Design a protein around this motif. Structure first.
Motif, mmCIF file in Angstrom:
data_model
loop_
_atom_site.group_PDB
_atom_site.id
_atom_site.type_symbol
_atom_site.label_atom_id
_atom_site.label_comp_id
_atom_site.label_asym_id
_atom_site.label_seq_id
_atom_site.Cartn_x
_atom_site.Cartn_y
_atom_site.Cartn_z
ATOM 1 N N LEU A 104 91.406 3.967 52.259
ATOM 2 C CA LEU A 104 90.727 5.290 51.917
ATOM 3 C C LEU A 104 89.495 5.125 51.008
ATOM 4 N N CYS A 105 89.739 4.288 49.916
ATOM 5 C CA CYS A 105 88.566 4.054 49.162
ATOM 6 C C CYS A 105 87.321 3.043 49.862
ATOM 7 N N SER A 106 87.735 2.409 50.921
ATOM 8 C CA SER A 106 86.524 1.769 51.791
ATOM 9 C C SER A 106 85.915 2.924 52.483
ATOM 10 N N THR A 107 86.719 3.709 53.348
ATOM 11 C CA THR A 107 86.029 4.887 53.977
ATOM 12 C C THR A 107 84.991 5.511 53.132
ATOM 13 N N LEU A 108 85.470 6.150 52.049
ATOM 14 C CA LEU A 108 84.749 6.911 51.115
ATOM 15 C C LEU A 108 83.424 6.084 50.802
ATOM 16 N N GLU A 109 83.602 4.802 50.408
ATOM 17 C CA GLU A 109 82.520 4.048 49.876
ATOM 18 C C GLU A 109 81.418 3.982 50.955
ATOM 19 N N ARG A 110 81.734 3.854 52.075
ATOM 20 C CA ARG A 110 80.698 3.611 53.292
ATOM 21 C C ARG A 110 80.193 4.927 53.603
ATOM 22 N N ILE A 111 81.186 6.007 53.442
ATOM 23 C CA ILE A 111 80.656 7.440 53.476
ATOM 24 C C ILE A 111 79.582 7.748 52.660
ATOM 25 N N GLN A 112 79.681 7.555 51.490
ATOM 26 C CA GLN A 112 78.889 7.778 50.395
ATOM 27 C C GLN A 112 77.583 7.138 50.544
ATOM 28 N N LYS A 113 77.697 5.613 51.071
ATOM 29 C CA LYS A 113 76.796 4.746 51.333
ATOM 30 C C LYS A 113 75.876 5.173 52.361
ATOM 31 N N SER A 114 76.631 5.843 53.424
ATOM 32 C CA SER A 114 75.772 6.184 54.620
ATOM 33 C C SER A 114 74.834 7.183 54.358
ATOM 34 N N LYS A 115 73.429 7.205 55.043
ATOM 35 C CA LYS A 115 72.651 8.142 55.152
ATOM 36 C C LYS A 115 72.798 8.843 56.476
ATOM 37 N N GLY A 116 72.301 10.336 56.405
ATOM 38 C CA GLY A 116 72.579 11.184 57.297
ATOM 39 C C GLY A 116 74.085 11.448 57.933
ATOM 40 N N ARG A 117 74.206 12.392 58.496
ATOM 41 C CA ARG A 117 75.769 13.099 58.525
ATOM 42 C C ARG A 117 76.174 12.237 59.492
ATOM 43 N N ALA A 118 75.660 12.039 60.697
ATOM 44 C CA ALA A 118 76.269 11.134 61.992
ATOM 45 C C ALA A 118 77.196 10.062 61.465
ATOM 46 N N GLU A 119 76.552 9.218 60.550
ATOM 47 C CA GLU A 119 77.271 8.118 60.070
ATOM 48 C C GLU A 119 78.523 8.394 59.280
ATOM 49 N N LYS A 120 78.367 9.504 58.262
ATOM 50 C CA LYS A 120 79.580 9.888 57.492
ATOM 51 C C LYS A 120 80.549 10.364 58.372
ATOM 52 N N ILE A 121 80.325 11.583 59.134
ATOM 53 C CA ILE A 121 81.148 11.791 59.904
ATOM 54 C C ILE A 121 81.815 10.869 60.985
ATOM 55 N N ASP B 246 85.162 15.336 41.825
ATOM 56 C CA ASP B 246 84.099 15.314 42.471
ATOM 57 C C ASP B 246 83.683 14.097 42.935
ATOM 58 N N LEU B 247 83.741 13.980 44.464
ATOM 59 C CA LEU B 247 83.480 12.583 45.114
ATOM 60 C C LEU B 247 82.209 12.247 45.255
ATOM 61 N N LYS B 248 81.443 13.184 45.330
ATOM 62 C CA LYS B 248 79.886 13.038 45.551
ATOM 63 C C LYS B 248 79.646 12.154 46.916
ATOM 64 N N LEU B 249 80.095 12.720 48.092
ATOM 65 C CA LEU B 249 80.323 12.023 49.088
ATOM 66 C C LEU B 249 78.779 12.289 50.021
ATOM 67 N N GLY B 250 78.097 13.262 49.732
ATOM 68 C CA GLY B 250 77.070 13.938 50.431
ATOM 69 C C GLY B 250 77.468 14.518 51.646
ATOM 70 N N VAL B 251 78.862 14.904 51.951
ATOM 71 C CA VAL B 251 79.316 15.735 53.012
ATOM 72 C C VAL B 251 80.062 16.924 52.281
ATOM 73 N N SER B 252 79.759 18.018 53.187
ATOM 74 C CA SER B 252 80.371 19.190 52.493
ATOM 75 C C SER B 252 81.880 19.591 53.102
ATOM 76 N N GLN B 253 82.571 20.216 52.211
ATOM 77 C CA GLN B 253 83.893 20.409 52.399
ATOM 78 C C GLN B 253 84.247 20.953 53.628
ATOM 79 N N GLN B 254 83.474 21.896 54.077
ATOM 80 C CA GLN B 254 83.642 22.408 55.228
ATOM 81 C C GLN B 254 83.285 21.580 56.524
ATOM 82 N N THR B 255 82.264 20.620 56.154
ATOM 83 C CA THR B 255 82.173 19.606 57.179
ATOM 84 C C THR B 255 83.331 18.757 57.535
#
Length: 218
Positions: free
Chosen positions: A13-30, A181-190
């Motif tokens: 989980l921590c890995s997934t969150l780290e690359r989500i927040q590190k990712s730019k643009g939503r396509a990569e985070k999703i 607050d995780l600061k993922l750059g992705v919205s909760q309803q996303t």
């Protein structure tokens, strides 16, 4: 065991969150979040094929991905100053030293506390990770419970049980799960949208013509 979360490491989980927040643009985070959902169902299938009929509930992970929606636990009673003290004395840091100095400054600007603590915690390591999602959830349960009993002693105790078995990354995201607050750059309803759209896409509603007849008829 009896749940998927008891076998998924918290480091996943921590890995997934780290690359989500590190990712730019939503396509990569999703895309990374969806990688985590696929890994989840993969663990479910592996456990089933080893004759462990476990539930595939994502709530043990979703409560950590959306901590502000946490409602089965109570308030942790953990403030940023508390963790500052905890990490100063835990790593034997000298008061008025550079790192402790950085730790006591309460800059609330995405350079939050957890990034500060992770910056100090990267050089001085820890035995990687050993806890699963369910064990982290149990320790957070214990922190909210001890707080409900007005027992800061046991709050620091359980928090230390979490910290001493978590890598620097895992502690970085643990702090954000406590502060909520995780600061993922992705919205909760996303996250909700991808979570529902995943299940919906992979469901393949098999056509059942007799069922369909009984449905359109009523």
């Amino acid at each position: 065991s009896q749940t998927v979360a008891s076998h998924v490491p918290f480091a996943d989980l921590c890995s997934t969150l780290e690359r989500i927040q590190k990712s730019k643009g939503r396509a990569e985070k999703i895309r990374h979040f969806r990688e985590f959902l696929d890994s989840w169902r993969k663990f479910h299938d592996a456990l089933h094929k080893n004759h462990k009929d476990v539930t595939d509930s994502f709530y043990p992970a979703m409560r950590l991905i959306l901590p502000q929606l946490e409602r089965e636990r109570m308030a942790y009673g953990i403030k940023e100053t508390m963790l500052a003290k905890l990490y100063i004395e835990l790593l034997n840091l000298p008061r008025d030293g550079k790192d402790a100095l950085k730790l006591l400054n309460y800059r609330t600007p995405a350079g939050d506390f957890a990034m500060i603590a992770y910056f100090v915690l990267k050089p001085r390591c820890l035995q990687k990770g050993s806890l699963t999602i369910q064990q982290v959830n149990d320790l957070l349960d214990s922190i909210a419970s001890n707080n409900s009993a007005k027992r800061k002693d046991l709050i620091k105790k359980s928090l230390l049980q979490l910290i001493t078995q978590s890598s620097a990354l895992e502690q970085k995201w643990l702090i954000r799960m406590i502060i909520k607050d995780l600061k993922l750059g992705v919205s909760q309803q996303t996250i909700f949208s991808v979570f529902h759209n995943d299940a919906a896409e992979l469901h393949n509603v098999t056509t059942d013509l007799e069922k369909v007849c009984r449905q359109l008829h009523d």
